[PDB]
Structures are given as C-alpha cells and as structure tokens.
Amino acid sequence: MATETNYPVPYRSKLTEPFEPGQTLIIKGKTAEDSVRFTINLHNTSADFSGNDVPLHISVRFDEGKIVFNTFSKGEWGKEERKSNPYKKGDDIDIRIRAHDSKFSISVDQKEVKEYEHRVPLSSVTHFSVDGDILITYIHWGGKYYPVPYESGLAGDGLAPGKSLLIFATPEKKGKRFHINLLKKNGDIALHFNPRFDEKAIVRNSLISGEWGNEEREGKNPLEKGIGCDLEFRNEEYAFQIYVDGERFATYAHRLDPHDINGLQIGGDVEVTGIQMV
Numbered sequence: 001m002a003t004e005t006n007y008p009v010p011y012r013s014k015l016t017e018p019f020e021p022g023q024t025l026i027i028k029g030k031t032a033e034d035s036v037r038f039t040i041n042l043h044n045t046s047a048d049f050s051g052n053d054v055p056l057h058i059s060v061r062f063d064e065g066k067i068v069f070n071t072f073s074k075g076e077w078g079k080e081e082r083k084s085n086p087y088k089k090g091d092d093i094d095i096r097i098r099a100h101d102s103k104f105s106i107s108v109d110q111k112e113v114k115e116y117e118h119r120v121p122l123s124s125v126t127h128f129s130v131d132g133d134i135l136i137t138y139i140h141w142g143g144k145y146y147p148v149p150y151e152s153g154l155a156g157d158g159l160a161p162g163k164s165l166l167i168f169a170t171p172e173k174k175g176k177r178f179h180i181n182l183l184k185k186n187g188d189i190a191l192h193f194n195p196r197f198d199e200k201a202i203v204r205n206s207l208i209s210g211e212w213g214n215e216e217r218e219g220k221n222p223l224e225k226g227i228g229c230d231l232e233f234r235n236e237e238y239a240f241q242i243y244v245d246g247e248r249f250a251t252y253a254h255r256l257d258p259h260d261i262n263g264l265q266i267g268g269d270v271e272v273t274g275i276q277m278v
C-alpha cells in the first residue's frame, strides 16, 4: 500500500459504454522497491459477477522482468505472449491501451511495444480492473479516431484562465512538423504551437488580423517522432503555461485578451488520440 487517496486497488470500473476502436485506456501509477507484479484487465461481466471472459489480460512482472499478455475465455487461458518489462522495482509506470478493429495497441512510457490481435470480441469488454503491487495515480478512458486536419469549437466558455486544454497525440514517425491553434471567434490565433523536428524547435506565435507576430522558440523540443506525448495548454492570467509530458516546456505571454478562446485547429504530421478540457 501507500496512501488511500484515488483509485485504491483492487480497482474495478464498469464502463459507461463498450470499449470501441479509437479509444484509449491510460493507466499511470507508482511501484515500490518490493513490488513484485500488478495486472491490468479488460473484463467481461454484468455488474459485479466477474470471472467470465478476459479479452485482454496484462501482467507486468518485476520478478520475471516481463510484460505478459493473454486472453481468458470459455473457462480457459490461451497461449501467453511476452515483451520485456522496461521497469525496475520502484519508479513510475505508464501503460496505455488503444483499441482498434483488429487488435489492441499497447504503449509503455508512450512507446508502442505490443500489438495484440483480438482473440475474442472487443465488444465483450464491459469492465476494466487494476490490481497488485501498484499505487494508481491516473486512469482515463476515452478519445476516438480524431481526423487531422482537425477543427472544432471549445465548449461555451472555451479555454479561459483557470482552465486547460489537454491533447494526447503522437508525432508521425516520418513527420516533419505539425501545429495546434487556439483561436478567437474572428479567426485570430491566440496561440500557435508548432513543433518543427527539422529545425529542432517548437515555434510559438500569434496570428492577429492576418499577421504573424514575433515568434518564440528556444526550448530544445522534448517531443520525438513516433513517441506519444501529453500536451497541456494551461491558460493563466498572464500567460499560457505549456506543459509537455508533465514538465513545463514554455510560458507564452498573452498577446490577445484571454477569455473567449473558443476555437481549436490541429494540423500537420501528427496523430491525435485524445482531446479534453479540464
């Protein structure tokens, strides 16, 4: 154990609606120097029964030093498939499971490590559970296949100080660049976030009355082609606090009045797997 707090294990959650292609289940947590193993299961059952089908069973083993995947159905287990466990007892874990129509794609530390073909119906997944030697710190399931170029409005209040836009994406393996625009009602871009792997920098700028501003770079670019990332545009009183994978990558002084940031555009060489306003 460690602390009661959020998601105490054994953790069990009954999905609102079945798990569908395009959706991702994100599980983050902490382990101890004596942690031996923990499991993540996509379960089948009514409400509390359990013990039925397990379309996908994931076992992270610190003793064996492996992450083992399998399926349980019709009262029996199939043949296990293994990958190396990159984690040592202690240090945090970050495992994400994205469903597709023919397989589950599992990433560890945002790096794709396994493609597990469906052995039983994905639609039979009605619950998911986490248990074992792990202290869960974050769980989230959602997203969809976001078409890119992407464009949509932001709530009614939009992105305002005190709020943050969370975007989960993966820069394309052979991508050169992509961008994310936070816009105003008239088309002006309050913030243009533009990673350029060719120039090894992330350009930040504003588009006011059809004109691009100064342009702020400097940072080193913490993004990498083919690796998943968590972008957070934390809107504050005096500036946007741009967080990349949990670390503050940059601050961007507001050039346009905050408030009323009602638009979002995403384009370029990137795959988007999650968008949320928190």
Ligand SMILES: CC(=O)N[C@H]1[C@H](O[C@H]2[C@@H](O)[C@@H](CO)O[C@@H](O[C@H]3[C@H](O)[C@@H](O)[C@H](O)O[C@@H]3CO)[C@@H]2O)O[C@H](CO)[C@@H](O)[C@@H]1O[C@@H]1O[C@H](CO)[C@H](O)[C@H](O)[C@H]1O
Residues within 6 Å of the ligand: 192, 194, 202, 203, 204, 205, 212, 215
């Ligand atoms: C407006 C534009 O094209 N911005 C580009 C940026 O272009 C600048 C550079 O090419 C520099 C090199 O010295 O010259 C600048 O123009 C000079 C001009 O040569 C001089 O004759 C004159 O006296 O001064 C001007 C201004 O100093 C160009 O403006 O190049 C960067 C790097 O490739 C581009 O990123 C930038 O395009 C903008 O990038 C943003 C993301 O960082 C957005 O994508 C935005 O939409 C682009 O406009």
